[PDB]
Amino acid sequence: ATFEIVNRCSYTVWAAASKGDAALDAGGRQLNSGESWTINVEPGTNGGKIWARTDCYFDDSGSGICKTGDCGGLLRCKRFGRPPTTLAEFSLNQYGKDYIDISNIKGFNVPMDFSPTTRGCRGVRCAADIVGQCPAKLKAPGGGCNDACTVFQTSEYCCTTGKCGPTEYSRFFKRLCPDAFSYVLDKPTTVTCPGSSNYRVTFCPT
Ligand SMILES: [K+]
Ligand SMILES: [K+]
Ligand SMILES: [K+]
Ligand SMILES: [K+]
């Protein structure tokens, strides 16, 4: 499966792609404003994520830091990113279909559209100004809008028991972005696509 990753932001981002225990494709690349990067993701990939990182510095070797979504200081992510991170999430070729969503469960850093480039399902989008409207207690000094689990580390925000309800904080995310997961047990906003669909992730789509 191909994913075209497109940075429409006025600022540089460092795209990242991982399934948590490994890179997808090269795992990360710089995208200047306007640039497109196409990756190939193995069929059957389960629990993959794509995200943007902001304000990154890398050396020679591909090692450094980012202020949002840093993945163990690698340019080329092999692991998931440090919140806050708006997340494009996908599982491919799961009993005949693909499943995509956007999640704010790990907070929000960059607005995003995640859409098929092939037939037979809708895209999803979270492109509201969550960072600008972020509740004060969730603002990350580093940049972005943290989720409540990240900030407060409670069973209720993190849904540790698998028992949790929506919260004042999750409802903020949901209000701004109805079509993205706002907490672990949110009413799913997952879209079913044909197996082996292809996709475009667009940062700052509007
Ligand atoms: K169709
Ligand atoms: K869309
Ligand atoms: K709400
Ligand atoms: K779910």
UniProtKB/Swiss-Prot annotation:
SUPFAM superfamilies: Osmotin, thaumatin-like protein. Keywords: Cytoplasmic vesicle, Disulfide bond, Signal, Taste-modifying protein. Belongs to the thaumatin family. This is Thaumatin I. It is found in: Cytoplasmic vesicle. GO terms for cellular component: cytoplasmic vesicle. PANTHER family: OS03G0233200 PROTEIN. Coiled coil: none annotated. Taste-modifying protein; intensely sweet-tasting. It is 100000 times sweeter than sucrose on a molar basis. Pfam families: Thaumatin. Disulfide bonds join C9-C204, C56-C66, C71-C77, C121-C193, C126-C177, C134-C145, C149-C158, C159-C164.
